[PDB]
UniProtKB/Swiss-Prot annotation, chains A, B, C, D, E, F, G, H:
Function: Calcium-gated potassium channel.
Domain RCK C-terminal as annotated: residue spans: 138-222
This protein's encoding gene: mthK
Membrane topology recorded in Swiss-Prot or TrEMBL: Multi-pass membrane protein
Subunit structure, interactors included: Homotetramer.
Consequence of changing D70N: At high calcium concentration, mean open time is short and mean closed time is long compared with wild-type
Shown residues within the full chain: 115 to 336 of 336
Amino acids binding Ca(2+): D70, E96, E98
Domain of life: Archaea
Protein name (record): Calcium-gated potassium channel MthK
Length: 222, 222, 222, 222, 222, 222, 222, 222
């Protein structure tokens, strides 16, 4: 599609940039000694301060399709998001919250998806005292190397599933995928109850083998 | 149960300490200026250096039921795990990996489970460009504020589900809990196929409402 | 009326505190060695961090009539403003902008008015090269020691001036105050034209002697 | 004309440098890491220590038409003003006070103008608790982007208004310019009373549209 | 006598406080970490900033008999001398000059005597290349451990030496004290010639043993 | 004569370097930004660390006639003095003691003349509370601009003054110079008693006009 | 021969680099400000992070004949040794321990030698309280400037001393070399008892004059 | 006998303190948070600065039998040694040199023996490239756990060995200790030649079993 802009350089945006090989990525960071490791990862580098609007317009934030913001603290991640909202009001911003209490401020400044790593990791430790199958499930469906891949299929308009119930559909019996949640717009419903009825435009978040996913796109098609 | 020792003090172990209320936690850290924040959360403080084998013995690593290791670097986390396996050879170690390439060296040193947050947050930011439900699923089932919970139920000895296959048991149709994976020992099989046979001592990893969980524990009992 | 919260301590808010003798003022700042200066100037002190919602609600932001934000940098002034807009979405926030390009990003954060002193003083030093009356005017009308004081008068309901234009009103000839501007809501018309007709509820900004103000309040009466 | 020497670099002298495009400006400061941004702003840089008289004579203080002094503290601004009066006893110094207390000492040292930003900011914060129209008047007439501009028109020798009082003058009706003060030398009379007569050589401080100001200059013509 | 105020804390004021035992000394400084070392030497501590007029007014500058000023820079010393002359117009000020070119400005700002240590040390280091007796003389007559002392004896009213010339009086031959200079008011005449006439109220600066000082004080009495 | 080496750069060595114009001075300092001010003062610059023996052997310490050592602290001054004494055991070193208690250590390390500026300044402050003629004498006889110059004349072998006593000589009656001290070798006797007898090779430290110094050089000659 | 890789830069690896003149040495360290002194020492510099396996493979660890690892702490030395054993499982690692406790962990990680300086220093301090001859023996046989040198002469296959005991050998009388130990593999027998017989392939650790050592090699000849 | 003072706290003196269990040790260091480590290891603590003569005499340097100096840098180790040589000119000072070029400048300061650990460890890492027996010998004979201990025996007065050469003595063939060196006073002859005749008072340095030492002390008897 279009290009992706990454403001700030940390260990989170490094691992993001491995799964973005084949897209056109511009990285915006203040330290000049990080120019080599960015250019090794297949991403163009732009030297500047990410909080400044004049250095943001270097990195093509206007036409971009997503802007991934991970600066050093949350004071600068909020200040960098509002600089982006001054340029383009409709671009999709994915922040990253260092502390827990700054998740609600980061949504008010304009971020469409706040991903806090230290709360996800902090809750996978205390759920792995007794038995650690929760921390093995989170770190195996996100990797693009395992056998079971967590995908998102949209329900087309003109589908055979418009208006049908879930128990009337029974998608795990026919396709082999596990419907862990159906989301509409900006909301996601984990474990949809039986009286939930599909609509065209909803997103079925599922887990399965890539053969079982190709059977699902035939089941929702016209 | 026995107590839980936390080596190091950062934002990951701060969120682990909020979920360890009620149990007994010792936090072992270098600074004298962190004593006020550990005592405010409900955990006794042990001033020391976690890389030393002598100061680990102050924090009662022997009688622990799990040790949670998160120091400033990856090199100090590898050293602190070797210090624990010098003391006790069967205690459980949960460690935090900063770089991706030190996951194989943190497990060889003796960590029973390695939780890498910057790989998790890196893979969620690359997946939330198009639509962010992969970041919303992982951040809601781990929080103790949602409706659906991700829990681990064991198969007791002499159950009704001894030897029974998955397509015959129908855990999702009878109980209504979503079965995302079945765990045995230290391996997890996400989306078990139709030929999978349940055994005694297995761990079922499931997502459902708390009322749905009560129907599962009554279903797999003896 | 109610109290006033001042977030952060600097030379801007120190001059704000002298003009607020008589009311009740809470000052919230991170240093503990600013305590003896604040209690000597007539205001209660609250030790805390102005960017944390836990220590903003200790200083009673909830029922305040205005909260005055002036922190060390513009990264934290945008953070402290969103911390107030999470607590109360209707309180009045007055912020001080250090630099010029952060004025639009401090209004998007939620500040009701942004006072940039280094843009005011930067433009008064440029206008004082030839003859210095621009800096003598601004620094005299705000000081409450001089004869001519710059006050605002609100137009009450059903006044004699309702619906009349300023050309037919002739405020300077019958009252003697100098109407430099008249504002409705959050806009202001400095030097309003002759085609401007007054309305009920407007705030008339004028400069004059205090004897001329009491002549005007009885002239704008209903 | 002649040049303008700026001693010290801060945020106030940066905004002063924007309005001095078209003049020749020598900036004299101690930081070497500010050489690029001064030369970006269209100003020749002269490295030195501004408190030292051997370095002030580098930057051509003698042939200056104004010296704008704003150093890091108030102690160095008094020392930099004492150094200038040793070189030229008649050059125009525009200072900047940090504290309120030093305005009487920065003017006894020799500065012909003291523009304190933290007192104009401190009195516009506490005048914006109720309704912020005083701050919207100060920050709108100083910018060279609004419609109304605060100008200074001098009275020529032999004018049509030589000797007449302001009440018989009727400046706001024939021209439209709001007359906020009349200045003679270094004394400004805000809201001149009706007994005040004009004199030859007076400087009129007015606010109006640019087409009204050209009506004002031709009305006071000889 | 009255007390002695010391503004600033460095090595010069430390040796001055070592030789001011018995009298009452207040030391006015910025740091809170100098209180133990001021209190260990026998001087009460007044925490403040000496550039402020109020914190100078705390330390009883009005009733002092001399104020000793040695701050971190020369600009702060000039500002502190201006503050003391703002408070009291007749107290004695002794100040330390760091650079040679600020002696004229420290005397013009109001110091009654300026003692420049780095000029003294530079001249003694330039004079001790060939043979170092100048440094030994200046460091030897000022210490309170030698045999010979450098003291000032006044000429009382109606003395035996009223009106008498130097070649007639023979202070070195009768008494045995070395007369290096005779001082009147604020001027010193080192090596007065043969035509010099003593007057009442003069100050004789002499070097000699204490018994020779007793003989001189008995010689110039009435 | 030969050349002079100055280790370190401070105000003391600068004021020393003003009085050494006409000699060949090498300055050794670690900061590279001081090359301009050294090259302005007529002294060649050598970049290096003055504590190192190789960077000392760069700066020609072997053939030098005096080495003037003023580094940042006293530890580095002692270390540089021992580094010099490793190279040449017989070169004359003039140190500079920052604190009082390091004078004996600087003498044991190898310095031939320790000049502490801060002790001289502290004693001249404490002796100038009442009347300030001692500071005027000390700062007036060292300058090479006043009328009375403190010189050192050697007694030649074959003089008319070999073996004569002071009271038999009476040098102030014949020449006009004031014998403030006669020194032999490394010792100096201030105010020589009457039974002191001259020897050939002694140094007469005197104060007087240069014509009186010429008359003294004729009086001690053969 | 092949090259030698030095990981980390400190004072120990600087003195090791002096005795490796004639070899090809690659230094791998993180500081860029050490590039000049490494290239002064005759060693190629390879910038990188030595704890990272992608940067150890830069410096050619695979084809090395020894790797000398000495990083800033003991935690990084264990991590750097674990990284090397992943690359080459048979290369010779010489480490350096900071604490005493980590010698058993630095050898279990894979180092074939651990040379702890702070334990050799700590036992030579407390053996030099009475008479310091043990410290004068350690620091004199290691330098390549004294007359006696500690050498290692191997026993050739088929020697004249194959199978004889040391008591019948009489090495100190025919050669003069003091035999302080005989080593087989990684075990050294200090002061071998008279029942110890020589074997083919043994390595003799001896001390002697260089003319005595050539007498020793020809005496153990085949 | 008497006590031992240790100036400064580091890992060298920590290993010195373990070997000095049983005697009385004072440790003098600037940090107060090293207090709990020192009292736990068996030594009294004295808070102070090791470079000041006031706080060296608090730790009883006067009557000590050896003072062990190891500070943070070589500038302060030379300063602390001269501070001891001002107090007692006959006490024994053992210093640790950080760098190599400061060994000669640490002996001129007055240290009786200088132990450079980074030269010992730097030369052991260079000799362990081919085969590592030089580092195994030095680290084994100093450790008091092994069989062969390196001790010194003094030759008493009137011994059987007085006047005999080492070729006629045959210490190794009779007693069985390995005479690596024999020192008179402050020199040492490692591998003494056959023309060396013994004298009364010499210190014989030998390596052997503890049973061989008691065989030697009865052989060197008188
Ligand atoms: Ca981050
Ligand atoms: Ca679990
Ligand atoms: Ca399946
Ligand atoms: Ca972490
Ligand atoms: Ca997605
Ligand atoms: Ca369900
Ligand atoms: Ca501010
Ligand atoms: Ca103007
Ligand atoms: Ca008026
Ligand atoms: Ca300023
Ligand atoms: Ca108002
Ligand atoms: Ca108008
Ligand atoms: Ca000073
Ligand atoms: Ca001289
Ligand atoms: Ca005398
Ligand atoms: Ca100095
Ligand atoms: Ca005096
Ligand atoms: Ca004379
Ligand atoms: Ca080291
Ligand atoms: Ca010994
Ligand atoms: Ca021999
Ligand atoms: Ca050390
Ligand atoms: Ca070898
Ligand atoms: Ca033996």
């Amino acid at each position: 599609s279009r290009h992706v802009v990454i403001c700030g350089w940390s260990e989170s945006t490094l691992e993001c940039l491995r799964e973005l090989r084949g897209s056109e990525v511009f990285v915006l960071a203040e330290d000049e000694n990080v120019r080599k490791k960015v250019l090794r990862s297949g991403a163009n580098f732009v030297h500047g301060d990410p909080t400044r609007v004049s250095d943001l317009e270097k990195a093509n934030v206007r036409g971009a399709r997503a802007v991934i913001v991970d600066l050093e603290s949350d004071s600068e991640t909020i200040h960098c998001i509002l600089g982006i909202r001054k340029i383009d009001e409709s671009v999709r911003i994915i922040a990253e919250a260092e502390r827990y209490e700054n998740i609600e401020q980061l949504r008010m400044a304009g971020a469409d998806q706040v991903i806090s790593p230290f709360v996800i990791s902090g809750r996978l430790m205390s759920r792995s005292i007794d038995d650690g199958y929760e921390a093995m499930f989170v770190q195996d469906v996100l990797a693009e190397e395992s056998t079971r891949r967590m995908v998102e299929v949209p329900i087309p308009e003109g589908s055979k599933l418009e208006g049908v119930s879930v128990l009337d559909a029974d998608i795990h019996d026919v396709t082999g995928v596990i419907i862990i949640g159906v989301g509409r717009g900006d909301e996601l419903i984990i474990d949809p109850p039986r009286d939930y009825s599909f609509r065209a435009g909803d997103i079925i978040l599922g887990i399965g083998k890539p053969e079982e996913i190709e059977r699902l796109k035939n089941y929702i098609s016209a």
